[PDB]
Amino acid sequence: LRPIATPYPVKEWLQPKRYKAHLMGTTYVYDFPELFRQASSSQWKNFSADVKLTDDFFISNELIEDENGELTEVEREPGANAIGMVAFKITVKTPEYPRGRQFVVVANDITFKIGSFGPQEDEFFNKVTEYARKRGIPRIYLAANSGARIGMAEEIVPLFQVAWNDAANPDKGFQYLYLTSEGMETLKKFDKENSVLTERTVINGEERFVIKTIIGSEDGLGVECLRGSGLIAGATSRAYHDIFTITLVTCRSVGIGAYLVRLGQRAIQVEGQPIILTGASALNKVLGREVYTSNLQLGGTQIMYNNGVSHLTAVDDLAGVEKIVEWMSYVPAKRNMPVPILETKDTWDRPVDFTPTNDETYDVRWMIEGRETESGFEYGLFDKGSFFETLSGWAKGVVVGRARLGGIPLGVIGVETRTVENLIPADPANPNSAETLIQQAGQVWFPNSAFKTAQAINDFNNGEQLPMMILANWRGFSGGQRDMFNEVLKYGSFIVDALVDYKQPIIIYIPPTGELRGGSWVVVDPTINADQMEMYADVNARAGVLEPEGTVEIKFRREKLLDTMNRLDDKYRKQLADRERELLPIYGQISLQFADLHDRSSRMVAKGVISKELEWTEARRFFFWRLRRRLNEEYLIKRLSHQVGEASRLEKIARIRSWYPASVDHEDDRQVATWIEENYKTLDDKLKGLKLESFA
């Protein structure tokens, strides 16, 4: 016992494994449910300071496998785990789910054979993944490991012999490894006969059993651990499309551990905890030179957060757990359940205060969440304090996060208008390599920002099942040599693919001072997914194939400018050339203005390419009721789908809308939402009566 005379019992002495996990710079596995309780208690405190929580608000039950390999809940003392993988089923009352929400927490035990993954740990992690998937509940993975377990047949070590080329001179070489009759007998005795595959031979009177293959009696030495690693890699790939998946990197995550981080997609990395494949010293041995200094050089946050492999960083394990809990607050309690509404002080019924200006630099986050000023807070489009930014270390030209609109959770994608700089590190393996600073113009999609946008769309859709708003403001894609060589077309195409797959309502909105041109419009047009997408443009937004400079270059050339001077200038209508020299700068401005007059939201409305033209200050009120109406109609379309056999979206929506009273304006979002909400049970009666269907 160290230390002596403490007021309460020494937990690191009661369970020495707790001390071992601490020495490795991580939380002991069995202490993680307490971090989740602390983080959930903080959630309530930030939401409503006066709430009185009792311990029954949070329940953690360890999951273990019974005799039949089926998962069962247990209450046992920490550290009794016979495998290096542990899991907990958590039931917690949260501000968004005050009656309770559930999720599973899977975690490596860093104290159990260094958190290595053997076949038993792989099979348990897979069983836990399937358990969560069957229930539709989130799967949280706490990564603290050493990758696949590695071993040798330790029983053959004191038994094997060597067929020396020259017995007197060992340095001269050897032919093979073998066992003697007594070696074979030792194996026969301990029932380890199948530990080796041998070929009996006789050399100078003595029978030698030539070792052809070493198998070993102990399970979890090599290939069997690689099979289990593949199983859990595929399981995680599947889980990402099915349930909400997230990983906290709490101590190192090696090999399969690094792949699990990425396969679950959503990842929070604790600072100083590396995500690696082969380590620095192993790499150095292969390279035959001291190239790398540390594992943190290979997989620290300055690699992974800058990459977008880590969506967020955390200063410590509790900060990481808090970020999991905060991320989950935007996510349904289980698969296919409605998105969790959480109304706060900042109600839908207000104008948007922060307005961008053409003559002034702004941070898009101000438009999203608002900004603090000396004269008071300027409210943004979304709820005050609701913006949760993710992938904040990578491709900063695009701003992605979760926010709330009058309480409705949604994914938000905005455009950073300021020039973004990123530092490409010098390659330690190349002596002729130096660090590169890359500058990327604002409102231009680059390979990295296009990849981040596609990734965001997929992460809001899969597991999170959230509606989305893109505040579309791009001039185009980078068509330059470097970015074209770096496959900008591939990443831009991933955006189209991500939108095709989207299952919840989408709002595309060109904001005030905003623009959408050529290739940038293409990749975000609502006809990519007409079932879910709608486009809107601000009265102060612009859009066309080219910018006015481009349009004039192709369609308002010198001949047309001169005919315009001929019509409009009395002096014009060698003495022409000097007049042309004087008129050209202003006539170039007239032509640019003429072109800009086509790029208005009024032309977008007339041509039917946008649903409506909007005023920014009224966009919060408009979008709140539009989104609320859309969620309600989507619920009814899904109910009608359950009883038909075969009908299109257009036919399903036309039928639902035919149930609305004649006096209801189908174009009034607030009226449609209000009527549906007042009639959910009446609509249920109607849907249940439609089960008079016999379709073959």
Residue list 167-186, contact with a copy of itself (CB under 8 A) = 170-171, 173-174, 177
Residue 544 interaction partner, one of a copy of itself, ligand B37, none, beta carbon < 5-8 Å per kind:
a copy of itself
**Residue from the set 343, 553, 684, 685 that interacts with a copy of itself by CB under 8 A:** 553
HSE-CB for 532 with a 13 A CA cutoff? 19
115: left (phi over 0), alpha (psi -120 to 50) or beta: left
- 150 among the known binding-site residues? yes
Shortest distance in whole angstroms from residue 429 CB to ligand B37: 7
| Min dist. Cβ of residue 9 to ligand B37 (A) | 42
**Residue 212 interacting partner from ligand B37, a copy of itself, none (CB closer than 5 to 8 Å by kind):** a copy of itself
Q: What, of a copy of itself, ligand B37, none, does residue 263 touch, CB below 5 to 8 Å by kind?
A: a copy of itself
Question: Which span sits near a copy of itself by CB under 8 A: 82-90, 165-173, 412-420, 460-468?
Answer: 165-173
Sheet strands side by side (includes 71-74): 71-74, 58-65, 85-92, 101-108, 139-143, 245-249, 266-270, 312-314
Instruction: Determine if 230 is a binding residue for a copy of itself (CB under 8 A).
Output: yes
Using omega within 30 degrees of 0 as the cis cutoff, is the peptide bond preceding 3 cis? yes
Considering beta carbons, is residue 253 or 386 the nearer one to ligand B37? 253
279 marked among binding-site residues: no
What DSSP designation does 338 have?
A: P
261 counts as binding a copy of itself under rule CB under 8 A: yes
From 93, 142, 526, 536, residue interacting with a copy of itself (rule: CB under 8 A): 526
Residue 158 contacts a copy of itself per CB under 8 A: yes
Regarding 479 and contact with a copy of itself (CB under 8 A), the answer is yes
Number of H helices, E strands in the chain: 24, 29
Kindly state the helix (H) or strand (E) to which residue 111 belongs, with its residue range.
Answer: none
Give me the least distance between CB of 312 and a copy of itself, in Å please.
17
Show the tokens assigned to 40: 């959930």
Nearest-approach distance from CB 433 to a copy of itself, in angstroms? 8
Applying CB under 8 A, the span of 26-34, 311-319, 558-566, 641-649 interacting with a copy of itself comes to: 558-566
398 near a copy of itself, rule: CB under 8 A: no
Position among 4, 82, 202, 223 found at the interface with a copy of itself (CB under 8 A)? 223
In the chain, % helix, strand, coil (3-state, to 5) comes to 40, 20, 40
User: Of a copy of itself, ligand B37, none, which one does residue 631 interact with (CB within 5 to 8 Å by kind)?
Assistant: none
CB of 312 within 8 A of CB of 305? yes
**Residue 262 marked ligand-binding:** no
**Is 93 annotated as belonging to a binding site?**
no
Residue number with CB closer to a copy of itself (343 or 487)? 487
User: Is there binding between residue 602 and a copy of itself (CB under 8 A)?
Assistant: yes
Regarding 53 and contact with a copy of itself (CB under 8 A), the answer is no
Rounded Cα distance, 389 and 414, in Å: 11
**What does the alpha-carbon distance between residue 129 and residue 194 come to, in Å, rounded to a whole number?**
34
CB of 607 to ligand B37, least distance (A): 19
In this structure, what is the dihedral angle of CA atoms 561, 562, 565, 567, given to the nearest 10 degrees? -100
647 is in an annotated binding site: no
102 in contact with a copy of itself (CB under 8 A): no
Residue 657 annotated in ligand binding: no
Phi and psi at residue 166, to the nearest 5°: -145, 110
- H runs (alpha helix) in 516-557: 518-522, 548-555
482 in contact with a copy of itself (CB under 8 A): yes
Rounded Cα gap, residues 228 and 132, in angstroms = 19
For residue 69, give Cα distances in angstroms to 233, 421, 447.
Answer: 21, 53, 46
- Output 41 or 278, the one with its CB closest to ligand B37: 278
Looking at the Cβ atoms of 14 and 429, the one nearer to ligand B37 is 429
Residue 643 touches which of ligand B37, a copy of itself, none (Cβ within 5-8 Å per kind) = none
Phi, psi of 510 (to 5 degrees): -80, 110
Query: Is position 134 an interface residue for a copy of itself (rule: CB under 8 A)?
Result: no
Should residue 10 be labelled a site residue for a copy of itself when binding is judged by CB under 8 A?
A: no
Contacts to ligand B37 by CB under 6 A: 278, 282, 285-286, 441, 444, 475-476, 478-480, 517-518, 546-547, 549-550, 553
CA 85 to chain centre: 24
Q: Which does 12 bind (CB under 5 to 8 A by kind): ligand B37, a copy of itself, none?
A: none
3-state SS, residue 544:
strand
Q: Which residue is nearest to ligand B37 (CB)?
A: 550
The letter for the amino acid at 171 is D
Residues in contact with a copy of itself, counted by CB under 8 A, come to a total of 140
DSSP 8-state symbol, 78: T
Residue 348 — φ and ψ, nearest 5°? -55, -35
Inter-residue contact 43 to 325 (CB < 8 Å): yes
Shortest separation between residue 537's beta carbon and a copy of itself, angstroms: 9
Tokens 């198998």 appear where? 215
- Residues 118 and 106 sit within 8 Å (Cβ to Cβ): no
Is there binding between residue 598 and a copy of itself (CB under 8 A)?
Answer: yes
The residue among 323 and 475 lying less far from ligand B37, judged by its C-beta, is 475
Asked if 585 touches a copy of itself (CB under 8 A), the answer is yes
CB-hemisphere CA count at 13 Å for 255? 18
Quick check: 687 binds a copy of itself (CB under 8 A)?
A: no
Q: Which does 178 bind (CB under 5 to 8 A by kind): a copy of itself, ligand B37, none?
A: none
Q: Is 319 annotated as a binding residue?
A: no
Task: Pull the structure tokens for residue 235.
Answer: 């399981």
The residue (of 80 and 426) whose beta carbon lies closer to a copy of itself is: 426
The token duo for 280 is 């620095």
Q: Buried b / exposed e across 275-299, counting CB within 10 Å, b at 16+?
A: bbeebbeebeeeeeeebbeebbbbb
Tokens 């800009």 locate to 596
3-class SS of residue 29: helix
Among the candidate windows 38-46, 271-279, 342-350, 360-368, which touches a copy of itself by CB under 8 A? 271-279
* 416 residue type, one letter: E
Binding site, annotated residues for acetyl-CoA: 148-150, 519
Binding site, annotated residues for CoA: 252, 555, 557
Binding site, annotated residues: 148-150, 252, 519, 555, 557
